[PDB]
Amino acid sequence: MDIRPARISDLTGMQNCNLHNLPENYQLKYYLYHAISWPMLSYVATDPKGRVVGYVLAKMEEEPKDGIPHGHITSVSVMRSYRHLGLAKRLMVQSQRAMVEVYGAKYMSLHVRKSNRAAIHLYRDTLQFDVQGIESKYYADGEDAYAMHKDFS
Amino acid sequence: QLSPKEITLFRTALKCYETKQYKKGLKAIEPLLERHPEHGESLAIKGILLHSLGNTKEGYDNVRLGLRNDVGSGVCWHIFGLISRADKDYVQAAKCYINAHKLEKNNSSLLRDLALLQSQLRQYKALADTRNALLQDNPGVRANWSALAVAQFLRGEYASAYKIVDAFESTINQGVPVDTQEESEAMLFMNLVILKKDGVEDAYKHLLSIEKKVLDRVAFLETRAEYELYLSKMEEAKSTIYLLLDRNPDNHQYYYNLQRAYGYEDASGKVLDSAEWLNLYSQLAKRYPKSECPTRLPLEKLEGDEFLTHVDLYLRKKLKRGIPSVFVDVKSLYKDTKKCKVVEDLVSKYASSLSTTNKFSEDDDNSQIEIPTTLLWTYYFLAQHFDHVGELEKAEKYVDLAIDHTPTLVELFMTKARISKHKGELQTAMEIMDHARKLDLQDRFINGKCAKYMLRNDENELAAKTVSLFTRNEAVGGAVGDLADMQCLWYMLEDGKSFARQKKFALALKRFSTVFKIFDTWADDQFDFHFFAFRKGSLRTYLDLMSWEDSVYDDPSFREAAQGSIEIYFALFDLPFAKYSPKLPDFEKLSSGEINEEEEKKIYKKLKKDLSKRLERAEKLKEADKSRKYDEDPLGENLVATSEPLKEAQKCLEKLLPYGDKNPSAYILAAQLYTRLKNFDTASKYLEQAKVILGQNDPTVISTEKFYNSIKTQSNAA
Amino acid sequence: SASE
Ligand SMILES: *[C@H](O)CS/C=C/NC(=O)CCNC(=O)[C@H](O)C(C)(C)COP(=O)(O)OP(=O)(O)OCc1oc(-n2cnc3c(N)ncnc32)c(O)c1OP(=O)(O)O
Numbered sequence: 001m002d003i004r005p006a007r008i009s010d011l012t013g014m015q016n017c018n019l020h021n022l023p024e025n026y027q028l029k030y031y032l033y034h035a036i037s038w039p040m041l042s043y044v045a046t047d048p049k050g051r052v053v054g055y056v057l058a059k060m061e062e063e064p065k066d067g068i069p070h071g072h073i074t075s076v077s078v079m080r081s082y083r084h085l086g087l088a089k090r091l092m093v094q095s096q097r098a099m100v101e102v103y104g105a106k107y108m109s110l111h112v113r114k115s116n117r118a119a120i121h122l123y124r125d126t127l128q129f130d131v132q133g134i135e136s137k138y139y140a141d142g143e144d145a146y147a148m149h150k151d152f153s
Numbered sequence: 154q155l156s157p158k159e160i161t162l163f164r165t166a167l168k169c170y171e172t173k174q175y176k177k178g179l180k181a182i183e184p185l186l187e188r189h190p191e192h193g194e195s196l197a198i199k200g201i202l203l204h205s206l207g208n209t210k211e212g213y214d215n216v217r218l219g220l221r222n223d224v225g226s227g228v229c230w231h232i233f234g235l236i237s238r239a240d241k242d243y244v245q246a247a248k249c250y251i252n253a254h255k256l257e258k259n260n261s262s263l264l265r266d267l268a269l270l271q272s273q274l275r276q277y278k279a280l281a282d283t284r285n286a287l288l289q290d291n292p293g294v295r296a297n298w299s300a301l302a303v304a305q306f307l308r309g310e311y312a313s314a315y316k317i318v319d320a321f322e323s324t325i326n327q328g329v330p331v332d333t334q335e336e337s338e339a340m341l342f343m344n345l346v347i348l349k350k351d352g353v354e355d356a357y358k359h360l361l362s363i364e365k366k367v368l369d370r371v372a373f374l375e376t377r378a379e380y381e382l383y384l385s386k387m388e389e390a391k392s393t394i395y396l397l398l399d400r401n402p403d404n405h406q407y408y409y410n411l412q413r414a415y416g417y418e419d420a421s422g423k424v425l426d427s428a429e430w431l432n433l434y435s436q437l438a439k440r441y442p443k444s445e446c447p448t449r450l451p452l453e454k455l456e457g458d459e460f461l462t463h464v465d466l467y468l469r470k471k472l473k474r475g476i477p478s479v480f481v482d483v484k485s486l487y488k489d490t491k492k493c494k495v496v497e498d499l500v501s502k503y504a505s506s507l508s509t510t511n512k513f514s515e516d517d518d519n520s521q522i523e524i525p526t527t528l529l530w531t532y533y534f535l536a537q538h539f540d541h542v543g544e545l546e547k548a549e550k551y552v553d554l555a556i557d558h559t560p561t562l563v564e565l566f567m568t569k570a571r572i573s574k575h576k577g578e579l580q581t582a583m584e585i586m587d588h589a590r591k592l593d594l595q596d597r598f599i600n601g602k603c604a605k606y607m608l609r610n611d612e613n614e615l616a617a618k619t620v621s622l623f624t625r626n627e628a629v630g631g632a633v634g635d636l637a638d639m640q641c642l643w644y645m646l647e648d649g650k651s652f653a654r655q656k657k658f659a660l661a662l663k664r665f666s667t668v669f670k671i672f673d674t675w676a677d678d679q680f681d682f683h684f685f686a687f688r689k690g691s692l693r694t695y696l697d698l699m700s701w702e703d704s705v706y707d708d709p710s711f712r713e714a715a716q717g718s719i720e721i722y723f724a725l726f727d728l729p730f731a732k733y734s735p736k737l738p739d740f741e742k743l744s745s746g747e748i749n750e751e752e753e754k755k756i757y758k759k760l761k762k763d764l765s766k767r768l769e770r771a772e773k774l775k776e777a778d779k780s781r782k783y784d785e786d787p788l789g790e791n792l793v794a795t796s797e798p799l800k801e802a803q804k805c806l807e808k809l810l811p812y813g814d815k816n817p818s819a820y821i822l823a824a825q826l827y828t829r830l831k832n833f834d835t836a837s838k839y840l841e842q843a844k845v846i847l848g849q850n851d852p853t854v855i856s857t858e859k860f861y862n863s864i865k866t867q868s869n870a871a
Numbered sequence: 872s873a874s875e
């Protein structure tokens with residue numbers, strides 16, 4: 001697989017990947033808003049034909065919680081066929097390094113639904129995130145989110 | 154003209170527009186209008202209010218009747234600009250804004266708006282004049298400088314771009330921030346301008362001088378390596394590319410670049426030093442084994458015995474780990490059909506080794522060790538291989554072997570469904586995919602695959618019930634309506650194609666039109682960024698946006714939807730019963746023309762009554778949308794009833810034609826269209842263009858020419 | 872993933 005920074009021209013393919021894999025979706029405009037606002041934070045995995053097969057869609061907190069700059073994963077997923085390879089872990093490390101070097105992020109945070117065993121085992125155990133707390137009825141269907149938060153230090 | 158009681162009321166009109174809720178506003182205008190109807194601005198303010206809470210031609214009339222009254226007045230032109238813009242009439246909003254500004258030369262916001270309109274229309278020339286006029290109005294803000302530079306860069310006027318950026322950068326001798334990240338991007342943009350004007354040699358020098366100012370370390374290093382490779386500064390490229398692999402050893406292009414820098418590989422093909430080319434990759438295995446690239450990549454270029462040894466080592470590697478992705482990985486090697494045979498024979502032998510023993514091949518029993526559950530993964534590989542190669546019988550035996558081993562594994566059933574699809578057994582493909590889905594109810598993906606297979610089998614409602622498990626159903630038209638809101642292209646396409654082939658045309662047109670809307674929405678989304686990008690200072694990214702946009706309609710999905718629509722519009726022109734979306738059995742009776750007038754009359758009466766109910770049904774749908782503003786006016790049927798489908802097919806063709814040379818189907822569709830329009834010279838040229846590419850003995854070409862011959866010789870008589 |  002080929003992991004590399006996201007470009008404008010592969011945003012639609014990030015969207016399509018999101019649509020296939022996650023209940024939480026956005027219109028293309030919101031992807032564009034990520035690209036123009038933080039042009040090097042998002043990464044993408046492509047297949048031999050160049051189409052998007054995994055991604056992380058990252059940003060920096062617009063309204064900084066307590067004045068300290070920090071990153072936010074807003075979405076990450078991989079087509080079912082390319083799972084269990086290391087794609088997500090690798091997409092996550094690339095994106096994190098950029099938050100630090102370009103924006104001076106002192107930490108990053110994300111949301112996972114309480115039952116997503118997969119995502120938890122990825123952040124908590126193999127990317128060393130902490131469970132910050134629990135956000136009641138965060139997803140549209142009412143499921144609770146774990147707020148996860150990794151401190152850079 | 155000139156009253157002092159209405160002035161405080163004229164103002165409250167405008168203020169109410171500014172503040173939305175246009176209701177109050179109208180009440181502050183109406184008094185002064187039905188007793189002074191000849192005041193253009195009054196008529197104008199009226200209109201935009203009636204436009205705003207909607208709708209729509211009510212407003213356009215008062216605006217027009219007002220604007221024609223005051224020649225004259227920037228206020229009128231301005232609100233005509235607003236409504237044209239809201240209605241996405243961008244070429245006309247520009248024209249309104251230029252006239253508005255030529256009458257109010259000191260209103261700078263008119264220009265700030267015009268710039269957006271002109272950027273959208275790609276009027277680069279006029280954009281530059283507008284951006285320049287804005288930079289003069291306020292040279293205080295960096296963004297105005299960036300916007301003039303970018304505009305000028307977009308015109309290829311690189312030198313003028315350089316002088317602008319250079320001029321601005323010097324007026325900050327102190328600093329250094331500024332934003333910092335604004336500055337970082339400003340530099341990388343500047344390095345683009347230089348490369349574009351003074352070439353690579355200069356750009357390299359400038360890039361080396363801005364290293365301290367550039368935060369995007371990946372852009373810096375990637376840009377640097379490109380230059381260093383271009384100048385044949387091989388040794389420096391070597392070290393730079395190692396900095397990139399250190400950062401990310403999973404970026405294929407880095408490898409082809411490191412190889413090029415060692416001189417082991419040309420910019421095209423990998424020659425020579427076949428021996429040292431390998432060796433580098435072997436060394437690259439010391440680039441922490443946390444990367445598959447050093448062993449996977451050489452597989453692309455290796456051949457003969459050295460391929461066999463390495464593909465063997467690679468396959469066993471991924472088999473012992475139970476990686477379900479192993480075939481999808483190796484799959485790309487099959488481009489040559491020599492390696493395919495090698496891989497096939499290799500993993501076939503794997504399955505029977507694993508017959509009696511637990512070791513691949515034969516000599517492996519001498520190195521001992523064993524494996525329990527590799528057969529599953531070997532079998533699963535073989536199943537995907539033989540499906541790809543087209544065996545199907547062999548393929549199905551292998552999935553069955555796998556399913557018998559471990560019946561709870563989702564992928565095994567995914568593959569079995571595809572094999573069934575390939576056998577032409579759509580109903581059981583659909584059943585098998587639903588079983589796959591059942592094995593994992595929490596995974597939206599397998600849900601999606603299931604719905605697709607259902608759509609392929611023309612089970613539309615079942616599919617919509619299936620995806621309803623993952624959508625946000627709150628609006629509009631349930632799952633399918635949310636899938637449209639979220640711009641899900643594939644579902645709308647598969648649904649549309651399904652409706653098309655059941656002759657449910659109104660629905661097919663509907664779904665395709667949603668694809669049109671999604672693309673139109675994409676084209677339009679850049680709009681706010683002709684402002685927002687310069688406020689963030691993301692100049693190189695903005696440039697990428699502009700050129701992505703320039704060809705956004707050059708897409709498989711848009712093609713497929715346009716194609717589909719045109720074919721249905723053709724049927725709409727040909728068959729007078731097509732507009733009733735007859736059920737397939739009625740469609741075929743009426744299409745064979747062997748039935749009497751007794752049965753024919755009966756079918757039509759039925760078709761009409763059924764359309765009535767669909768229409769009646771659509772009214773109830775609208776009432777439900779409305780009672781929940783912007784509705785949807787054909788929940789199904791308005792399209793299919795068109796008075797002239799050719800015109801619609803023509804519109805569908807517009808955005809296919811610029812890409813005709815790589816997608817000659819556009820030209821053939823065009824030929825078929827203008828044949829029906831009785832316009833044969835325009836028809837034959839399109840057919841000829843299509844004949845040139847792909848053509849002569851091409852099936853679609855000759856059947857179009859036969860159709861062409863049949864209509865042209867029909868215009869006359871003898 | 873975040874929920875907007
Ligand atoms: C907001 O966006 C956060 S929550 C949303 C996450 N996305 C999704 O839930 C949907 C679609 N994409 C996926 O589901 C992928 O599985 C994710 C994105 C979760 C990870 O993809 P990937 O398969 O590439 O994960 P990884 O790169 O290997 O990362 C390390 C890793 O994870 C697992 N692992 C997680 N969960 C499981 C389960 N249930 N079973 C086995 N293994 C699991 C690993 O085994 C990993 O590798 P390891 O060797 O353990 O470190």
Ligand SMILES: [Cl-]
Nearest residue numbers: 019020601641
């Ligand atoms: Cl979907």
Ligand SMILES: [Cl-]
Nearest residue numbers: 029030031033
């Ligand atoms: Cl937005």
Ligand SMILES: [Cl-]
Nearest residue numbers: 047049051079
């Ligand atoms: Cl695909």
Ligand SMILES: [Cl-]
Nearest residue numbers: 016017020079
């Ligand atoms: Cl896919």
Ligand SMILES: [Cl-]
Nearest residue numbers: 172173174782
């Ligand atoms: Cl509102």
Ligand SMILES: [Cl-]
Nearest residue numbers: 247248276279
């Ligand atoms: Cl013009």
Ligand SMILES: [Cl-]
Nearest residue numbers: 276277278308
């Ligand atoms: Cl021009």
Ligand SMILES: [Cl-]
Nearest residue numbers: 277278279308
């Ligand atoms: Cl010119």
Ligand SMILES: [Cl-]
Nearest residue numbers: 276278279280
């Ligand atoms: Cl012009």
Ligand SMILES: [Cl-]
Nearest residue numbers: 310311312313
């Ligand atoms: Cl020039």
Ligand SMILES: [Cl-]
Nearest residue numbers: 384385386389
């Ligand atoms: Cl030199």
Ligand SMILES: [Cl-]
Nearest residue numbers: 395398399440
């Ligand atoms: Cl090294």
Ligand SMILES: [Cl-]
Nearest residue numbers: 571574602605
């Ligand atoms: Cl498929």
Ligand SMILES: [Cl-]
Nearest residue numbers: 571574605609
């Ligand atoms: Cl397919």
Ligand SMILES: [Cl-]
Nearest residue numbers: 296684687688
């Ligand atoms: Cl601006």
Ligand SMILES: [Cl-]
Nearest residue numbers: 684685688689
């Ligand atoms: Cl802002």
